[PDB]
Point group: D3
Chain length 175, copies 6
């Protein structure tokens, strides 16, 4: 049913993100099982860190690494895992890990759900604190994870973000 959900209304400008992990939650990392569509516990994280933003993916996309693009979505309040939020891509956090290339997009709630992020149009528009903190989380989160590692490659603009969306959508399609 969650596997039924669109990529967006008007890709890559207007997309839907399926939330897997809420902002500020306990460090349980969940994932939607592509087969059933149910939320599965992937791992209990060992580090005393929490996701700075709601974390999820854009359905009907296949990124370079085998998986749908992953998106981080700031909100006034934490969202329920498994809920879909309409968003608008604004930047990318480039990082390579041991999968190879695992960019995380940054998307802000679309303006129809709230006007609070209307001024956030590109990656420099986002608070520096927050960017520092996302980078920082991704750099350290798998610290205590034996066979897992991340090189935080840097930040990219909304155009690069939107290129990734299209490219991944296409990658999954036929057309």
């Amino acid at each position: 049913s969650l596997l039924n959900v669109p990529a967006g209304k008007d890709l890559p400008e207007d997309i839907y993100v399926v939330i897997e992990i809420p902002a500020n939650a306990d460090p349980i990392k969940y994932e939607i099982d592509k087969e059933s569509g149910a939320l599965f516990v992937d791992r209990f994280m060992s580090t005393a860190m929490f996701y700075p933003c709601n974390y999820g993916y854009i359905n009907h996309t296949l990124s370079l690494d085998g998986d749908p693009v992953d998106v981080l979505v700031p909100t006034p309040y934490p969202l329920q895992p498994g809920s879909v939020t309409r968003c608008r891509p604004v930047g990318v956090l480039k990082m390579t890990d041991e999968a190879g290339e695992d960019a995380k997009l940054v998307a802000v709630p679309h303006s129809k759900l709230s006007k609070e992020y209307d001024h956030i149009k590109d990656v420099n528009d986002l608070p520096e604190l927050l960017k520092a903190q996302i980078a920082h989380f991704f750099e350290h989160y798998k610290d205590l994870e034996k066979g897992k590692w991340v090189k935080v490659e840097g930040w990219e603009n909304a155009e690069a973000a939107k290129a990734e969306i299209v490219a991944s959508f296409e990658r999954a399609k036929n057309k």
Copy 2:
């Protein structure tokens, strides 16, 4: 799967309500997408208000306004969004908005889930504080919402509530 869920066991006396928003939660308003059945964020509310009761709808119903009846269900404890609770209708809060007529029913957990609300048989049986507070929420919640408004038209009995249930069920059916 949630779109599979019945209206009730024995409509309008015994109904099932699909919970969209929990009592006392952060002001995120979710909704079940009729197409996929997943929970979607509709809007981040701007007012510093919270739903006094769990909020949801009765599936397989079509109210006047295009949507299933909406129900408010008091409980000892907040329920998870997307869960179904068996209830018994006891009153209605009449209000017209810019959709036209948007009555909210008030339903209490059926007696098989708890005996705590057995004495609540009709609308006057409900605490005055609570009624004041629901009315009050509905009157003000979209205050900061540009193109949205509500005239809280008053309270109605369980018979009026049950008439709405039947009428909406029928409206959606064929028969």
Copy 3:
């Protein structure tokens, strides 16, 4: 979709548990409806007690009592109702109620989600406090429930636990 979920990867050693009720939650007892697969409120508990562990079941199993085996899964952090966790059976709490025989298994997160419970291989490996507390909960939880009762019959090893899993799986299958 949740009714689609497997029993396990490699039954009875490696199973999946579908979580209905989180550890430490408010005393709302939910259940997955076999027909729709949605989470339904079963009862508001009257006692001022909370489940010591996440509570759930193993799909595609039919226990003696008509239902799938029920499993209690300790975790660092409470899990979301409706999520699946991979586990490894380690003991059983035997108890008969007014259904007849309602053993609850005890399963620990598999080692791929966390190494924290690697040392927990059998029932004596589990903290005494916790065992006392599960027994204790099951003994008293339906105290204020008119037509419901439990005789906590005692604890059993992982072999007995795994026998139950197989036996219930088989019971549900054909083969």
Copy 4:
């Protein structure tokens, strides 16, 4: 400073209760240290039970058992440990333990803080569910506690409650 706090405005009708443990909290039992006035952890409870109401005491009182009277105060919402609430006594739960006689009073927020409990004038006015549940908690809470036990002796009216308040106040005074 908390040891400075009065017994009440107009004892025994109008009293102040110093809250030690909130309603519904994790099972940590705190206590105010008479010497410093700070909140001290007394014990981590082993049972999977939670206090049904905010729990505290009336300062400047000496009960039979060596301690100030203990009061249970229902509220719409859980209170912070160490805060004082103005209340009005309405009933008593008689029970003897291994201290000897440890009645717990039941007090409702005074009407100046809320009108919600104005109808609660005597012990029969209180919900049956709640009374069952307090009795029930007190009966079982120290179950797993080696050298601790309770015989829940039954419920008493507001007059008996108010007699205890006066008697304990006097017991502590001179006059």
Copy 5:
């Protein structure tokens, strides 16, 4: 001890606010008792509203209305009632009620506790959403309160805010 706390390091530019009510909490309104210094429940609010910011006061100040100035302090995270936060005044919300004149200041965490609010220097620097929402809360919060009312008189700058601080400090002093 809380009655011992200074007004600020360097009044009115650098002040300390004693937090009475946290941001986003349940609608319990607490207050520090000037006599003991303990936190007292003042009222259970009847409206389904929550304070948008942490709410408190500046000690050693006497406002026009008989009380210390009241301050609203935004923070990344809710603060504990009774804790002191160092802040910097940036604006005022003028409103008259039935006390007569009850301005609420708006203060941001000082830069030594966080750099997140360094850009917030004056009242226009604060998000519009937030200002709308504070105004909005103050306008409606005592709606269901019989003998209580508020006319939200409008917003003022940091200079007006700082004038109030000095003036109130002086009012309480001698010198």
Copy 6:
């Protein structure tokens, strides 16, 4: 009042720790002000990390760095900031920062509050996960803090821990 609190019952074996920051809380770092004894916000942390254990200090102690020893206390449940817990020292985490030498002790609830940590007698008795995670937190927590840094120097036994307690007590005394 909190400045009145003893170091312990029977130093260094049996000590009291005054809790400043709870386990798993939002990343607000509080501190008790030696002058008033009230809890003060020190800093909003910028990293998306949370204290793995309740964090506090032993009153009437002066460590090398100018401050009382700091203690980390695991508990079943998070404690309230400002509450005192009786503990028993079991290990030390040596680390030097830009203060110079800032060892953090590790103390477990005394056995009179719970038997759950009776087996924890020395530093190797503590879970490896937890030790990894404390080390890990201390190593990274001030990452985004300009003028602050930590070299996690390693772990030490209970004897070294108890030597620190005595030495710091003495340092503060006269005798």
